[PDB]
Ligand code: CLA
């Protein structure tokens with residue numbers, strides 16, 4: 001994150017044989033684009049939703065500086 | 074103050090006290106350059122070369138952000154030009 | 159200009175003169191929202207006193223322990239879990255008993271931090287200048303302790319060494 | 323009309339300032355921004371560049387009170403962000419700059435704070451206004467020279483690998 005090598009958080013995502021709640025077939029990534037659903041739970045990837053909320057957080061924090069307050073801008 | 078307007082163009086105060094003082098001959102070419110740069114950055118990050126995890130290029134991203142901006146710069150350029158600036 | 163702590167900024171309107179320890183330190187202008195400085199001073203002084211006691215307890219627990227085994231833990235954060243819940247609930251109930259009457263007191267009084275606590279009468283006979291000097295001493299020591307107790311907690315949570 | 327550029331006219335916003343006003347603003351940036359904000363930015367750049375030039379030069383010559391400090395001020399950045407020193411300097415710099423927002427916002431709004439003024443004269447090197455103006459001009463000239471010098475130092479020390487000559 002500090003080094004800017006943000007791709008490292010997307011390397012080695014959860015495989016297609018991952019059993020939810022277990023380490024079998026898991027990965028190490030935390031923020032990924034995968035799209036679709038988990039092959040086992042038939043639901044969105046947890047790494048997809050974490051990345052989604054991080055992007056939403058950055059966007060809303062940026063957008064929260066729009067209106068004027070005690071600092072002239 | 075009084076950003077309300079009814080003439081041909083709004084007063085320069087609507088541009089803020091940073092764009093209110095830019096000559097239109099500066100904003101115009103700057104807006105065109107920003108639009109061209111942003112379009113090229115968007116077409117280089119995507120379209121011409123498909124996006125990949127290993128290829129994000131903050132320059133192209135930050136660049137692409139100049140396209141939305143360009144819109145604002147040339148709007149301000151027109152406003153300055155019509156206000157004799 | 160008017161801030162002594164930040165010699166370049168001008169202090170906010172409510173930072174002036176009285177309420178000892180006033181060094182013009184409110185860059186964010188938090189005092190501009192509070193109706194008065196009574197409640198924030200009460201909170202600051204409560205934090206100062208709790209932090210002084212916390213630092214003293216941190217050091218003493220580092221060096222001195224009660225005869226019982228349950229109080230033999232040297233790490234204060236580990237002692238937070240090793241000590242039986244009975245002792246901690248007794249401490250919490252004592253604090254809450256002290257806190258409810260002062261809860262009635264703080265939100266309305268002119269000096270919410272003045273709890274009338276002076277068993278040794280260290281303030282009887284002291285002049286106004288001496289009393290203000292004592293208040294300044296208390297506030298200084300409390301702010302330094304707050305910084306210190308937070309540093310001790312952080313270094314224990316980050317390295318496991320409770321001291322030095 | 324300008325003192326620095328005889329051809330181009332004198333900038334409209336530059337009439338007199340003890341900061342070294344020689345009327346050098348060919349692109350008219352002083353018309354864009356308030357002059358005070360630009361002066362604060364220039365003084366900040368001056369001080370940062372002076373500190374950085376001195377630090378680069380010294381740390382390449384005599385800087386090793388340990389093991390991790392055995393670098394050549396070109397690989398020093400990565401080594402010492404791994405060590406954790408740069409993190410602490412960044413924390414304190416961020417605190418100072420966050421305070422500086424209010425200082426910049428208290429000016430440009432009223433008050434009386436001159437650009438770049440932090441009331442930091444513990445040794446009282448400046449006594450009266452004349453000394454203050456003379457040393458403000460001296461500080462800004464030294465800071466501009468240090469900006470250019472540090473630019474040269476980094477560009478040369480990245481174009482090759484060497485010592486003080488670079
Ligand atoms: C619980 C903490 C606490 C509280 C409630 C106060 C409250 C007060 N202080 Mg104070 N102070 C504190 C801690 C605190 N202080 C510490 C630790 C120091 C030492 C640096 C000081 C140093 C100080 C000075 C020098 C002065 C004051 C003054 C004041 C008064 C006016 C400012 C105000 O309204 O801010 C209210 C403050 C809060 C509501 C706290 C908000 C919490 C913020 C967001 C802190 C965020 C964390 C922080 C950035 C980092 C902490 C982590 C770690 C590094 C410590 C007010 C009674 C001024 C005074 O006497 O006026 C009468 C004055 O001149 N304080």
Ligand SMILES: C/C(C=C=C1C(C)(C)C[C@H](O)C[C@@]1(C)O)=C/C=C/C(C)=C/C=C/C=C(C)/C=C/C=C(/C=C/[C@@]12O[C@]1(C)C[C@@H](O)CC2(C)C)CO
Nearest residue numbers: 365366369370373387388389390407411414415416418419
């Ligand atoms: C203990 C230690 C290290 C070590 C050791 C041992 C125990 C000693 C020995 C062992 O053998 C090894 C080891 C590792 O353990 C000590 C570390 C060194 C320290 C403690 C020195 C810190 C350096 C300070 C710097 C480099 C700060 C730079 C200043 C800036 C200012 C920025 C400004 O922009 C701001 C924000 C406002 C502007 O207006 C103007 C200015 C002021 C210019 C940054 O630009």
Ligand SMILES: CC(/C=C/C=C(C)/C=C/[C@@]12O[C@]1(C)C[C@@H](O)CC2(C)C)=C\C=C\C=C(C)\C=C\C=C(C)\C=C\[C@@]12O[C@]1(C)C[C@@H](O)CC2(C)C
Nearest residue numbers: 210213214275276277278279280299302303306309321322
């Ligand atoms: C306890 C204290 C004061 C206690 C006073 C009390 C109870 C007085 C009570 C009374 O007067 C009243 C109220 C009313 C009177 O009628 C009755 C009595 C009863 C007489 C002040 C402490 C004040 C404590 C202070 C100021 C502490 C500062 C601590 C620092 C700087 C520590 C730094 C470090 O801990 C770090 C940060 C990291 C470590 O690794 C390294 C080091 C260096 C050890």
